[PDB]
Amino acid sequence: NYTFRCLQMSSFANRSWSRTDSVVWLGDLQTHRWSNDSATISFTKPWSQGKLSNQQWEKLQHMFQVYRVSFTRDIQELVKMMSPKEDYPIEIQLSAGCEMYASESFLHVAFQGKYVVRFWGTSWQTVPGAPSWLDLPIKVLNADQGTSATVQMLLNDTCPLFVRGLLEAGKSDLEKQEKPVAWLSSRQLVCHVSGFYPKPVWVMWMRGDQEQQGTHRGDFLPNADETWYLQATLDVEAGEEAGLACRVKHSSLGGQDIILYW
Amino acid sequence: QKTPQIQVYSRHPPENGKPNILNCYVTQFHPPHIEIQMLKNGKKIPKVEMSDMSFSKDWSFYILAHTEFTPTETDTYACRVKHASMAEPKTVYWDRDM
Ligand SMILES: CCCCCCCC/C=C\CCCCCCCC(=O)OC[C@H](CO[C@H]1O[C@H](CO)[C@H](O)[C@H](O)[C@H]1O)OC(=O)CCCCCCCCCCCCCCC
Numbered sequence: 001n002y003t004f005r006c007l008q009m010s011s012f013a014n015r016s017w018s019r020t021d022s023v024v025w026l027g028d029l030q031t032h033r034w035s036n037d038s039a040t041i042s043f044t045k046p047w048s049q050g051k052l053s054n055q056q057w058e059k060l061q062h063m064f065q066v067y068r069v070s071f072t073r074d075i076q077e078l079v080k081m082m083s084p085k086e087d088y089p090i091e092i093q094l095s096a097g098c099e100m101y102a103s104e105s106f107l108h109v110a111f112q113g114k115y116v117v118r119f120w121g122t123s124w125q126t127v128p129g130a131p132s133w134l135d136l137p138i139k140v141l142n143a144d145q146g147t148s149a150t151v152q153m154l155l156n157d158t159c160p161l162f163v164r165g166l167l168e169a170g171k172s173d174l175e176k177q178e179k180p181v182a183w184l185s186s187r188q189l190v191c192h193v194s195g196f197y198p199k200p201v202w203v204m205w206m207r208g209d210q211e212q213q214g215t216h217r218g219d220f221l222p223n224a225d226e227t228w229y230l231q232a233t234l235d236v237e238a239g240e241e242a243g244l245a246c247r248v249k250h251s252s253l254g255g256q257d258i259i260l261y262w
Numbered sequence: 263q264k265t266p267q268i269q270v271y272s273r274h275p276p277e278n279g280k281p282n283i284l285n286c287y288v289t290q291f292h293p294p295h296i297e298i299q300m301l302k303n304g305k306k307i308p309k310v311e312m313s314d315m316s317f318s319k320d321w322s323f324y325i326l327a328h329t330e331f332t333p334t335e336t337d338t339y340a341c342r343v344k345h346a347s348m349a350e351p352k353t354v355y356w357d358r359d360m
Pocket residue numbers: 006007008022024032034041063064066067070071074075078079086090092094096109110111116117144146147150151154162
């Protein structure tokens with residue numbers, strides 16, 4: 001169930017200083033970046049154009065290029081109209097895309113780090129709890145029929161279509177298996193598991209065949225080579241270390257679990 | 263404003279004298295402007311590679327810094343972070359196991 005997420009981060013510092021930077025993710029793999037410094041959307045994979053033609057890619061980029069400009073002008077005009085009520089600095093975040101199963105699309109907008117607005121059905125709406133000054137700019141935005149028709153097209157049609165092209169074209173990278181390497185250290189005993197892909201994994205402290213229940217699994221931390229890192233810790237009496245092992249199961253291993261004895 | 267969390271860990275099992283990669287993963291901060299340095303014996307490592315800034319489901323930012331490093335019996339490594347949420351730079355040292 002691959003979630004395709006397009007993430008825009010726009011910071012407005014004052015009058016005439018701002019920037020917008022975007023990244024695009026298909027599941028946990030980055031497929032695009034779009035720097036404020038760049039006129040064009042960058043590929044971060046050989047397959048980042050999916051099944052789109054050079055021409056179709058070009059149009060979709062030009063629309064995003066007009067959008068990035070329109071967005072910036074619009075937000076700056078809105079602050080101007082609001083003054084002094086809404087003041088710089090302003091942080092806007094957009095998270096837009098689709099999740100495949102059939103599919104469902106989303107476009108969520110946060111302001112000052114808080115979710116305020118979504119596109120849903122045929123219109124923009126503020127979300128419950130959002131500041132009331134947003135109601136009138138959303139109403140105005142809603143009167144732009146062309147934009148609503150474009151956004152509906154992108155969310156309902158384009159996204160799922162582009163992503164089925166990515167899944168096909170990215171298949172080799174998406175379905176890649178990388179093997180984890182484990183090591184132990186430490187009282188609290190730490191089992192470090194690095195370099196695995198995909199994300200699902202099982203790491204447990206054992207005494208023979210018995211899973212040690214106090215095993216605290218940590219957060220998944222990414223490595224820079226599109227693999228994962230995880231630790232699992234166990235608090236043990238400084239009389240118990242003997243006989244304990246760390247066991248790792250992972251799809252890449254083929255039933256040959258890593259077992260590391262303390 | 264949200265305060266950055268910092269985790270420092272290595273790509274491969276650290277073994278003294280063998281080249282490795284040190285990661286500094288900084289998460290849970292807002293706003294997105296931030297300065298991240300990686301330190302060898304408290305001195306700034308110049309070659310530091312950053313991922314693109316991105317953000318999570320709860321909207322808080324994250325970013326990954328990494329650098330080549332060779333652990334030894336005599337070198338400390340750290341990640342130092344400057345962010346509007348904190349009055350002073352926040353430094354976390356590689357605990358030498360991670
Ligand atoms: C798919 C491939 C991956 C590559 C993706 C990389 C980058 C993706 C980044 C973001 C995705 C965004 C999706 C939206 C797409 C829009 C489509 C489009 O073309 O519209 C063009 C339009 C072009 O709009 C322009 O031309 C129009 C002609 O039809 C009108 O004349 C408009 O007035 C004019 O602005 O862009 C806009 O409507 C401006 C954007 C404003 C929408 C943002 C709403 C945010 C809510 C604000 C709440 C924050 C608090 C306020 C602070 C004070």
